[PDB]
């Protein structure tokens, strides 16, 4: 979907019908293109939402790990994630977001315990 790859013009060159365009107006060409671009955007969006569902489960489990390590009363939530991460990273749930490093730092500060 990303960049549409000039889908309208590539489809419009096909909609010339090997240059037999003589019985189709200019209105038909644009409307078919707009439908194909919208369906390409929808197909991209549905796939991206499937990736998000995998991340939603891991955010709760990492929050459960951070709560087990840094509870309300037992260990205070660090003021800087670098101090936290140096002491956190033996446990496997911080390693389960080791490709999602921007998410793991944000959800740590935004944990808000109790």
C-alpha positions as a Python dict, from the first residue, in 0.01 Angstrom:
ca = {
    (1, 'X'): (0, 0, 0),
    (2, 'X'): (273, 252, 107),
    (3, 'X'): (343, 507, -180),
    (4, 'X'): (62, 354, -401),
    (5, 'X'): (353, 296, -646),
    (6, 'X'): (185, 541, -888),
    (7, 'X'): (-108, 276, -888),
    (8, 'X'): (-344, 524, -1055),
    (9, 'X'): (-121, 589, -1360),
    (10, 'X'): (-13, 221, -1388),
    (11, 'X'): (-382, 116, -1372),
    (12, 'X'): (-475, 409, -1609),
    (13, 'X'): (-219, 282, -1866),
    (14, 'X'): (-399, -57, -1833),
    (15, 'X'): (-741, 127, -1851),
    (16, 'X'): (-628, 256, -2193),
    (17, 'X'): (-710, -110, -2289),
    (18, 'X'): (-402, -150, -2516),
    (19, 'X'): (-487, 202, -2643),
    (20, 'X'): (-849, 98, -2721),
    (21, 'X'): (-988, 367, -2488),
    (22, 'X'): (-1225, 507, -2751),
    (23, 'X'): (-1550, 379, -2593),
    (24, 'X'): (-1471, 472, -2229),
    (25, 'X'): (-1486, 832, -2101),
    (26, 'X'): (-1247, 1013, -1865),
    (27, 'X'): (-1490, 975, -1567),
    (28, 'X'): (-1470, 591, -1558),
    (29, 'X'): (-1085, 592, -1539),
    (30, 'X'): (-1053, 810, -1225),
    (31, 'X'): (-1331, 638, -1024),
    (32, 'X'): (-1188, 284, -1072),
    (33, 'X'): (-846, 413, -960),
    (34, 'X'): (-990, 571, -642),
    (35, 'X'): (-1158, 238, -551),
    (36, 'X'): (-834, 41, -598),
    (37, 'X'): (-629, 292, -388),
    (38, 'X'): (-886, 280, -104),
    (39, 'X'): (-890, -104, -102),
    (40, 'X'): (-506, -109, -98),
    (41, 'X'): (-508, 125, 206),
    (42, 'X'): (-768, -99, 381),
    (43, 'X'): (-564, -417, 309),
    (44, 'X'): (-251, -249, 456),
    (45, 'X'): (-444, -130, 767),
    (46, 'X'): (-596, -474, 846),
    (47, 'X'): (-251, -641, 833),
    (48, 'X'): (-93, -372, 1061),
    (49, 'X'): (-371, -428, 1319),
    (50, 'X'): (-271, -799, 1335),
    (51, 'X'): (86, -694, 1433),
    (52, 'X'): (-58, -467, 1708),
    (53, 'X'): (-253, -757, 1872),
    (54, 'X'): (77, -949, 1934),
    (55, 'X'): (226, -635, 2096),
    (56, 'X'): (-79, -582, 2327),
    (57, 'X'): (-22, -913, 2512),
    (58, 'X'): (354, -844, 2557),
    (59, 'X'): (293, -493, 2698),
    (60, 'X'): (81, -641, 2981),
    (61, 'X'): (338, -919, 3048),
    (62, 'X'): (629, -670, 3053),
    (63, 'X'): (420, -449, 3286),
    (64, 'X'): (361, -758, 3504),
    (65, 'X'): (742, -818, 3508),
    (66, 'X'): (810, -452, 3592),
    (67, 'X'): (549, -470, 3865),
    (68, 'X'): (708, -790, 4005),
    (69, 'X'): (1056, -628, 4005),
    (70, 'X'): (948, -266, 4084),
    (71, 'X'): (629, -295, 4295),
    (72, 'X'): (444, -17, 4478),
    (73, 'X'): (616, -85, 4814),
    (74, 'X'): (904, -328, 4752),
    (75, 'X'): (1120, -148, 4499),
    (76, 'X'): (1033, 210, 4381),
    (77, 'X'): (987, 275, 4006),
    (78, 'X'): (1320, 432, 3879),
    (79, 'X'): (1318, 798, 3767),
    (80, 'X'): (1528, 721, 3456),
    (81, 'X'): (1481, 408, 3239),
    (82, 'X'): (1862, 365, 3189),
    (83, 'X'): (1905, 313, 3567),
    (84, 'X'): (1610, 70, 3552),
    (85, 'X'): (1727, -125, 3242),
    (86, 'X'): (2079, -186, 3372),
    (87, 'X'): (1923, -344, 3686),
    (88, 'X'): (1620, -502, 3503),
    (89, 'X'): (1777, -701, 3219),
    (90, 'X'): (1830, -1053, 3348),
    (91, 'X'): (1458, -1147, 3313),
    (92, 'X'): (1333, -1260, 2971),
    (93, 'X'): (1032, -1023, 2933),
    (94, 'X'): (1262, -718, 2882),
    (95, 'X'): (1432, -929, 2613),
    (96, 'X'): (1085, -990, 2455),
    (97, 'X'): (1075, -619, 2367),
    (98, 'X'): (1445, -596, 2261),
    (99, 'X'): (1337, -509, 1907),
    (100, 'X'): (1064, -276, 2043),
    (101, 'X'): (1299, -59, 2256),
    (102, 'X'): (1098, 265, 2207),
    (103, 'X'): (783, 88, 2335),
    (104, 'X'): (956, -73, 2638),
    (105, 'X'): (1106, 256, 2766),
    (106, 'X'): (776, 444, 2728),
    (107, 'X'): (557, 177, 2893),
    (108, 'X'): (808, 157, 3183),
    (109, 'X'): (780, 533, 3265),
    (110, 'X'): (405, 515, 3201),
    (111, 'X'): (353, 205, 3425),
    (112, 'X'): (226, 422, 3719),
    (113, 'X'): (235, 160, 4008),
    (114, 'X'): (-63, 101, 4246),
}
